[PDB]
């Protein structure tokens, strides 16, 4: 009966907890205590692109580490040239409520979405010299929050309907769907192998999906509030998520548990974006407290500050070759550190 | 600088176009609609005519009013309410047919992002309220007074006014029975007063 099912669930949870606690022979902090620290890292602003008029909600690097795309709530999605701070394109939108962006790995497509429950696709290499909407996917009920290109013919989306689905930019149909989240999904990230991807809902939990067989594998918990960002370690074996409880955490896939906690007493604001480095040594996190921090990824100690913004930072992301850093805030300014 | 001059010219031209469009598109007056399900929003939105964001724009007395409705979003309000920080006002509609509406009004009045946007208050089904009174202390067990139409309506209005905590914002009122189309005039007057106050406070003299 119901009591039997509840007892079985409790026994399964007990087995999972015991297996997770068994593997924690020693902590990462003890092992990393002997290794030398990195000292102090100082970074200075190199450029500043002033084109937008309203708040900025996304910024995605190109595949060649040269071009960038920035999406704002003014109804525009400009395309930048990092090395000379030049505008190359300008794409007006039908809806002014957009809170996502993406940039194709081959450099021929741009995707946007928002509060209208529709994911758009744009064509950059038309023969008539203009940008034309090739497709407009539909079928999601809740607001779309994130979307990434697997390749030139597929796209994965995470919407507010507590579901994630895999599309097809050729026929525009939901090929597969993923279920298991009891709250809004506000963060999605795909592995470098482009075969697995993890997502973060708004009920303090993160799960790992499989694109091929279309089902869940594992569930990680331990936060206290709604997760707002997620990313992958370059090795593809660990991921770090920063919740609204002012604490970033590091999760190991094989160990099936957490490793380190990143907390500072002076900071109480909730993280809005996280991103690793090329060698996996710096975890440059953005904060709602008008500044950015550069945590050492192994010793859990701070190593600098990217101060300079006049409002909350809503995005951050390093390049492909780990040479620059781009952050955009609600003051309508994008700054390229180095 | 062999042919980068052409790219620079293109960038300058599109920047100029962006600035021109941004300035030309900033003269509209935004608004917002909140309330319960079928609590009078339908009557007002049908009176002036014309599942995500639903937008309407009608030009009245040389002022372009844009109206939004977000009733179709069945999710937590704390995840998208910050997008509407810059609205010029907020329109709230309540019906006297029935804590359901006062709780949401108190929540929206005390929100951090809305410490300066005024709320225009509309009441609906006044004669229906009188009929229900004839057929009012159940909805207000703490009501210490006679069960008469005038006193009950006035005390409920005072309860609406009591939830305010921020002096910087003002709450108006208007009575209606979901059968009149005079709301345009009162919206116009409230909006022009709010515009004057906001501009003067921006200049710092207010």
């Amino acid at each position: 009966e119901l009591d039997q099912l509840r007892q079985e669930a409790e026994q399964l949870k007990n087995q999972i907890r015991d297996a997770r606690k068994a593997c924690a022979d020693a902590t990462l902090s003890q092992i990393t205590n002997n290794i030398d620290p990195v000292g102090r890292i100082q970074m200075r602003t190199r450029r500043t692109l002033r084109g937008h008029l309203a708040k900025i909600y996304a910024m995605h690097w190109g595949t060649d580490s040269r071009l960038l795309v920035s999406a704002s709530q003014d109804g525009k999605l400009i395309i930048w040239d990092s090395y000379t701070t030049n505008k190359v394109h300008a794409i007006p939108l039908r809806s002014s409520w957009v809170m996502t962006c993406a940039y194709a790995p081959s450099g021929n497509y741009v995707a946007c979405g928002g509060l209208d429950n529709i994911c758009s696709i744009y064509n950059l290499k038309t023969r008539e010299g203009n940008v034309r909407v090739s497709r407009e996917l539909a079928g999601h009920t809740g607001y779309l929050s994130c979307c990434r290109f697997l390749d030139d013919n597929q796209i994965v989306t995470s919407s507010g309907d507590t579901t994630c689905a895999l599309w097809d930019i050729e026929t525009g149909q939901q090929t597969t769907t993923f279920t298991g989240h009891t709250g809004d999904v506000m963060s999605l990230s795909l592995a470098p192998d482009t075969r697995l991807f993890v997502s973060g809902a708004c009920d303090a939990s993160a799960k790992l999906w499989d694109v091929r067989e279309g089902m869940c594998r594992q569930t990680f918990t331990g936060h206290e509030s709604d997760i707002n960002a997620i990313c992958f370690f370059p090795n593809g074996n660990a991921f770090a998520t920063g919740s609204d409880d002012a604490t970033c955490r590091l999760f190991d896939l094989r160990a099936d548990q957490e490793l380190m906690t990143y907390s500072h007493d002076n900071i109480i604001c909730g993280i809005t974006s996280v991103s690793f480095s090329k060698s996996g040594r710096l975890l440059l996190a953005g904060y709602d407290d008008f500044n950015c921090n550069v945590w050492d990824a192994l010793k859990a100690d701070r190593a600098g500050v990217l101060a300079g913004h006049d409002n909350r930072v809503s995005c951050l992301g390093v390049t492909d070759d780990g040479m620059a850093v781009a952050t955009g805030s609600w003051d309508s300014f994008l700054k390229i550190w180095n | 600088s062999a042919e980068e001059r052409a790219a620079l010219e293109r960038s300058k031209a599109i920047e100029k176009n962006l600035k021109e469009d941004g300035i030309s598109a900033a003269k509209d007056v935004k608004l917002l609609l909140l309330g319960a399900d079928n609590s009078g929003k339908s009557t007002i939105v049908k009176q002036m005519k014309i599942t995500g964001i639903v937008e309407t724009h009608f030009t009245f007395k040389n002022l372009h009013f844009r109206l939004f409705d977000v009733g179709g979003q069945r999710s937590e309000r704390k995840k998208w309410i910050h997008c509407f920080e810059d609205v010029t006002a907020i329109i709230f509609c309540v019906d006297l047919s029935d804590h359901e509406s006062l709780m949401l009004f108190d929540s929206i009045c005390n929100n951090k992002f809305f410490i300066d946007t005024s709320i225009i208050l509309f009441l609906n089904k006044k004669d229906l309220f009188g009929e229900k009174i004839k057929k009012l202390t159940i909805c207000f067990p703490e009501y210490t007074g006679p069960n008469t139409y005038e006193d009950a309506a006035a005390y409920i209005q005072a309860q609406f006014e009591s939830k305010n905590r921020s002096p910087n914002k003002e709450i108006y009122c208007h009575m209606t029975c979901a059968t009149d189309t005079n709301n345009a005039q009162v919206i116009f007057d409230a909006v022009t007063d709010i515009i004057i106050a906001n501009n003067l406070r921006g200049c710092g003299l207010y």
Epitope: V88, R127 | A7, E9, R10
Partner: single-chain antibody, 230 residues
Framework: DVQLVESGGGLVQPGGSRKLSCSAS????????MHWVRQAPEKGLEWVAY????????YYADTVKGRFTISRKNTLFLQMTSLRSEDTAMYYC??????????????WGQGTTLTVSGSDIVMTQATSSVPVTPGESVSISCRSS???????????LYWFLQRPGQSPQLLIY???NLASGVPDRFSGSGSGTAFTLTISRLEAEDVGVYYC?????????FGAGTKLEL
């Protein structure tokens, strides 16, 4: 689809004047630069005029300055005055759009036959004529006066193909990239001064004449032209 039809050519007495038009349809003509290139009955290609987007910048060649004027719906003009003997040619119309990653000199018109009764980078092609049978691999070389390897790391050499009885088509732009629609058989390379294009598995349709062009700084000078005929 895309078409640049044009007309306005005919026999004109010496010292006269004539107007030519280059009608354009099928694309966004409002943001595309327009050139004008001419070709004598026997000699190779030359350069005449150019107008940018928005009429901001206009250039002219050495022998045409003052005489002709280029002016810009979806119609382009070129006023001609004081015709002389050397003016007889078949003028073409060429579009071009410039930004990071663009492909200038993409589409060519069809031509309007007209008859009348130093600091310049010089390009040389030694192989005036080359006899090659089908089924073999060929190679053509274009040399220059000044190095075309700018400090940015980009070279500004262009290679054109003009089949018999047609209009030229772009084959290789910036000395290393292949334009859209061209099969991967053609390949071009080089460094600084010596440029060489490599053609693999020559087919019958590849017969024609090949031209070499630079884009470092105006004016633009074509090569002499190599005839890789059968």
């Amino acid at each position: 689809d895309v078409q640049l039809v044009e007309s306005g050519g005919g026999l004109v007495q010496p010292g006269g004047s004539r107007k030519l038009s280059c009608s354009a349809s099928g694309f966004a003509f409002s943001s595309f630069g327009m050139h004008w290139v001419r070709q004598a009955p026997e000699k190779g290609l030359e350069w005449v005029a150019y107008i940018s987007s928005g009429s901001g910048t206009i250039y002219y060649a050495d022998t045409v300055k003052g005489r002709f004027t280029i002016s810009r719906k979806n119609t382009l003009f070129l006023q001609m005055t004081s015709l002389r003997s050397e003016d007889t040619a078949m003028y073409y119309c060429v579009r071009s759009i410039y930004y990071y990653g663009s492909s200038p000199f993409d589409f060519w018109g069809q031509g309007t036959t007209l008859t009348v009764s130093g600091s310049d980078i010089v390009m040389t092609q030694a192989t005036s004529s080359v006899p090659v049978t089908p089924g073999e691999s060929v190679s053509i070389s274009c040399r220059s006066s000044k190095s075309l390897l700018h400090s940015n790391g980009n070279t500004y050499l262009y290679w054109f193909l003009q089949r018999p009885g047609q209009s030229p088509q772009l084959l290789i732009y910036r000395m290393s990239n292949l334009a859209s629609g061209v099969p991967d058989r053609f390949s071009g390379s080089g460094s600084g001064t010596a440029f060489t294009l490599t053609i693999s598995r020559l087919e019958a349709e590849d017969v024609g004449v090949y031209y070499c062009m630079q884009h470092l700084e105006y004016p633009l000078t074509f090569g002499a032209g190599t005839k890789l005929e059968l």
